[PDB]
Design a protein around this ligand. Structure first.
Ligand SMILES: Nc1ncnc2c1ncn2[C@@H]1O[C@H](COP(=O)(O)OP(=O)(O)OP(O)(O)=S)[C@@H](O)[C@H]1O
Ligand SMILES: Nc1ncnc2c1ncn2[C@@H]1O[C@H](COP(=O)(O)OP(=O)(O)OP(O)(O)=S)[C@@H](O)[C@H]1O
Ligand SMILES: Nc1ncnc2c1ncn2[C@@H]1O[C@H](COP(=O)(O)OP(=O)(O)OP(O)(O)=S)[C@@H](O)[C@H]1O
Ligand SMILES: [Mg+2]
Ligand SMILES: [Mg+2]
Lengths: 25, 570, 108, 541
């Protein structure tokens, strides 16, 4: 027959961001 | 926040610029133009680009530039102070307009903002990127300085500031220019360090920097190497406060930081007995040991390609010839770390990411390349690539690059140096042999042709890059006797830890060698025969017998029964 | 490997006196990133505290600050807007060279 | 308003480069604006500032008008994605400001918002999709071709919304009117005189030598720069004289090529190719003469175009001056030379292609096919007949101005009583290939005297290297013969002679420097005795 070619599945990292407050006075 | 370069030139604080005449004319040429009036200096770290920007200002006072440029004045942007000098918002914008108003009033004047890349990509940074092109409108001139890596990211994407700006290529200064340029800053260091530098001392620095510290550009590195040399005299000699230092200390600092000429006695015996030291450990491979040592000696002497590695070797042979053993032992004798890699794992095209790192932003990007990080950590290393044939052809492309220039860039972009790495690879292209001998009353040596398999598996260009392809021959009967002795010594060391001493008669060693000697299998069966005959009885005695406490064992062979006799005394 | 022992150890050698005369009198310090962040609730507290320590080093001209884990200051406390990281505040002083700070970090 | 520029209102007084021509190209630009739906004019192609010139040019047209009164009244805007992508230090800030722009931008439903390098966003790109389908704001986005194809075509909300306006590269003759329209404007820009005929002589390098800068982009920065350099170079002397010579200095340093090449040396270079080729590579007088005759016909380009520019076929063992000419052949020409051995590159990854983006930027690529002699010949048949190379776009091959140098090593590999070299080529090659072949050159035998000179080349590199160390190597001519006797093998030609000096001679010499008789020596008594026909090594201080 013919050769069998496999395909990979790239996975990209994803992140979120938190926030820090600071009272003016 | 700002400085007047014209006043600084009169004061003399800034160092007079030396050389770079070609770069200055190109910069002034684009600067004079009505459009593309914002010159950009693209140069690596420490090349000299920043000095060129200030050198032009000093030249204005001299008057060698065109008369129209005399009106122009240069101002430095104190990006650091401006960021700190803010309380709520808008501080940068108000002050920048007033400065630019003077520039707009006097179109001749220029505004040299150092590290222009920083401006583009907290609150003030957002405004600062837009303030440059919109308010300037392309009429007000501005000088910039950004490296090749930063220039691609910062300027290529926007394309608005890039069109207004006009790059000016930069190149490393010549060796002659380097000594001239360093002379300007040499008086400063001698005064603070209270040392004197001879003309020969500065001559050695440039040559040593390129050969040992080629990673870092020669001009800035030249300044750094001579700075450390001055400090050495101040602190290294505890007594006599010795000034009047020469090349000898210069070699002492450049070579030490880089981690050498004038081979010492220790270094001499390291390479002088490298071949004889490796013959004792590995027998029957004198042709292979001499070839490997000779290439390594060529690199130390320096009769070899500078960019290429010290040596590239491919060990192809039958099983049990100690091809990999000579590699491991070479590292031990040389005292160089053995970066042992197995290419069986790297048999897929996707696995290349483990070698040069994963793509940026991936879950495994933090790990990085396994080959680039390892070589960087240990610049002097022995890169043993076992079973290269098993790996996918994609890795061979990477290896071709290392052989040609001894460099490899990962996703991060770090540059590695393989000049000091003795690349070594092993393959099993010809292990397969014709088990069927001559079909006749007497046998014949119909062994398969040697090196024919290597040619088919490996492409011709790859073979050419390799310094030499050393074929390992089958071990001789005499060689097997020597192999048994080293294995017996290893057994004695293990027994010594348990308090047991073993004495093996010379006759017994010959019997074991004959029983376990197989040409095709190699030297590995000898360990198996030793394990079956010596280790197995001793282990039973060591656990359930007299040897538990510790004893003396003597092994002999009975001629009538042709079997080994073991005597335990304890 | 021993990088921390080499920095802290330098202090021990100095008191013993088996060091060069130039470095015989150097008041080594050990910056604590966590300690600064403890009282940074109010705006501008980080700049005030960080600037105060930096001023002490330059006026002395002999004080040396050993800051382990220098990677941490790359992304130090920045609530919002100002983005005044510790690295940004210390970047100009290091360029001049008035203050010298030892660092220790892993290869990764 | 921070990122808004009024191109139409700003151009009322002036200040925009008028790009004469492209009148028929701009008809579509106006035809899109008159559409009830899907009226999003998009300009696709690739260039640097030139690509946006179609958009910047359209700004002038809106001012000039001369279109339907309803369509005539309008306005265009432009925003820089980069300006809002710098200093954000977070993801999603750019999109937030993009939506906030509507608070002031939404004044009328007839206007356009130009975008630059929109490929970077597709930089979240989520909010871009709904704003498109709304249609309340028109969009003109400049971007490249290859990247744009991968993302925009696969989408639905983007491809249908826009009206693709393809752009093409002007021909050699068409390029004359590219600068003719801008010649008066450039005269006013610098207020200096320029030679009219000089513009036609500025396309020598732009057409094929660089292949990295487009023709409009090259013209804008080469004529203006030449006038500027000539005007500003003499500070004391005021001169407005410009010519081809001035253009050579500007092109020479940026293109890193000899000044003579930029001049009108096409006739001189052809005549000088013969002697120049002889200078680089020593020997091969017969082969070089036939070689330059083929190259003479190849540069003509006044004959059958379908046939390849040339098919140089050699028949010589490896290392006998065949693979050496490869370096000298390209070095004299100055073009980059490819090395893709057919045997080594017969994989499915590359054989089907007949190594994805590099091949396009190769005006004259001398492809090397080593070991071709040992279905490879059939593959080359289509190349000669139709000059077609498979690729993503499927355009014709570049063999009109590209040559393929295939080398054969079958004259001696077949046998060693053996037949002549010309017998193996007949049987191994295909009948069609042999007949269509322009000519056959032979490197089977290398002159005896020439071999000695090549050996001296490597010895000189070793000798000069040793002189730096502080020692002098004296390789007597008698010893040199030994270097070529063992190195030369009829089966494998003289290929082992290349490295026969880095192993047989460079190995003992190095040992002496590290540890031996004298770390620093010289006066090597090289000689060959007749006891065993071997070299001698001795020296003293
Ligand atoms: N062409 C030159 N002529 C004279 N002095 C020079 C020249 N180039 C560099 N120097 C001196 O060397 C110093 C250091 O080099 P710079 O050009 O300032 O470094 P740089 O290119 O800005 O690199 P950094 O510091 O890594 S951002 C300058 O400040 C001058 O004192
Ligand atoms: N020529 C030799 N001299 C001394 N010991 C040897 C020799 N050949 C093999 N040995 C020993 O046998 C083992 C060889 O292990 P390796 O070095 O991995 O062999 P190898 O020849 O690389 O194996 P292959 O061919 O890859 S299956 C070690 O225990 C060596 O000490
Ligand atoms: N050369 C040395 N002399 C004396 N004690 C040492 C030496 N090297 C290591 N040690 C001791 O062993 C410890 C090893 O951990 P550290 O050196 O503190 O770690 P590090 O090298 O800073 O690495 P991390 O990753 O930051 S924990 C030291 O803290 C000492 O207690
Ligand atoms: Mg092995
Ligand atoms: Mg630690």
């Amino acid at each position: 027959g013919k050769t069998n070619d496999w395909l990979d599945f790239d996975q990209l990292a994803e992140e979120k961001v938190r926030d820090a407050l600071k009272p003016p006075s | 926040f700002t400085t007047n370069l014209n006043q600084l030139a009169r004061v003399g604080g800034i160092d007079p610029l030396i050389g770079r005449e070609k770069e200055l004319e190109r910069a002034i040429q684009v600067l004079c133009r009505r459009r593309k009036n914002n010159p950009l200096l693209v140069g690596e770290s420490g090349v000299g680009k920043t000095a060129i920007a200030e050198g032009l200002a000093w030249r204005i006072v001299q008057g060698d530039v065109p008369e129209v440029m005399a009106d122009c004045t240069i101002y430095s942007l104190d990006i650091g102070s401006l960021l700190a000098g803010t309380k709520y918002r808008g501080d940068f914008e108000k002050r920048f307009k007033a400065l630019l108003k003077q520039l707009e009033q006097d179109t001749n004047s220029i505004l040299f903002i150092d590290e222009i890349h920083t401006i583009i990509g907290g609150g003030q940074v957002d405004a600062a990127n837009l303030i440059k092109p919109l308010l300037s409108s392309g009429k007000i001139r501005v000088i910039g300085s950004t490296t090749y890596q930063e220039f691609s990211n910062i300027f290529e994407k926007d394309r608005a500031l890039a069109r207004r700006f006009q790059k000016i290529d930069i190149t490393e200064p010549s060796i002659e220019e380097t000594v001239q340029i360093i002379n300007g800053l040499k008086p400063k260091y001698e005064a603070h360090h209270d040392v004197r530098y001879t003309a020969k001392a500065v001559r050695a620095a440039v040559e040593l920097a390129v050969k040992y510290i080629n990673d870092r550009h020669l001009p800035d590195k030249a300044i750094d190497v001579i700075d450390e040399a001055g400090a050495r005299a101040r602190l290294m000699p505890v007594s006599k406060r010795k000034k009047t230092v020469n090349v000898a200390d210069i070699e002492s600092v450049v070579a030490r930081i880089a981690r050498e000429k004038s081979v010492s006695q220790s270094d001499r015996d390291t390479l002088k007995n490298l071949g004889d030291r490796l013959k004792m450990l590995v027998f029957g491979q004198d042709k292979a040991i001499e070839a490997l040592t000779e290439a390594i000696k060529m690199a130390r002497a320096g009769l070899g390609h500078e960019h290429k590695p010290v040596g590239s070797f491919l060990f192809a042979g039958p099983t049990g010839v100690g091809k990999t053993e000579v590699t491991v032992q070479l590292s031990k004798a040389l005292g160089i770390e053995l970066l042992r890699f197995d290419m069986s794992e790297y048999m897929e095209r996707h696995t290349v990411s483990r070698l040069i790192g994963a793509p940026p932003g991936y879950v495994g990007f933090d790990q990085g390349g396994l080959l680039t990080d390892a070589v960087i950590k240990h610049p002097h290393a022995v890169l043993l690539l076992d079973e290269i044939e098993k790996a996918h052809p994609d890795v061979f492309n990477i290896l071709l690059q290392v052989m040609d220039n001894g460099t490899l860039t990962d996703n991060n972009g770090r540059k590695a140096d393989f000049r000091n790495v003795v690349l070594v690879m092993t393959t099993n292209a010809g292990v397969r042999e014709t088990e069927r001998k001559s079909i006749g009353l007497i046998h014949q040596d119909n062994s398969t042709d040697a090196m024919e398999e290597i040619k088919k598996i490996f492409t011709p260009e790859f073979r050419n890059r390799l310094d030499n392809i050393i074929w390992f021959d089958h071990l001789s009967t005499d060689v097997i006797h020597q192999v048994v002795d080293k294995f017996i010594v290893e057994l004695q060391v293990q027994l010594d830890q348990k308090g047991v001493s073993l004495e093996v008669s010379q006759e017994a060693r010959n019997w074991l060698a004959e029983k376990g000697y197989d040409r095709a299998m190699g030297a590995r069966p000898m360990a198996r025969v030793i394990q079956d005959n010596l280790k197995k009885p001793l282990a039973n005695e060591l656990l359930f017998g007299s040897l538990v406490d510790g004893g003396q064992v003597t092994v002999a062979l009975d001629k009538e029964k042709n079997e080994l006799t073991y005597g335990f005394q304890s | 490997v021993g990088k921390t022992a080499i920095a802290e150890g330098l202090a021990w050698r100095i008191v013993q006196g088996d060091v060069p005369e130039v470095m015989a009198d150097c008041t080594i310090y050990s910056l604590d990133i966590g300690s600064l962040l403890a009282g940074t609730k109010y705006r501008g507290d980080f700049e005030k505290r960080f600037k105060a320590l930096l001023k002490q080093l330059e006026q002395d001209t002999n004080s040396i600050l050993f800051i382990d884990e220098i990677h941490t200051i790359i992304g130090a406390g920045a609530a919002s807007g100002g983005q005044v990281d510790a690295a940004n505040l210390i970047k100009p002083l290091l360029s001049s060279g008035k203050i010298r700070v030892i660092g220790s970090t892993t290869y990764q």
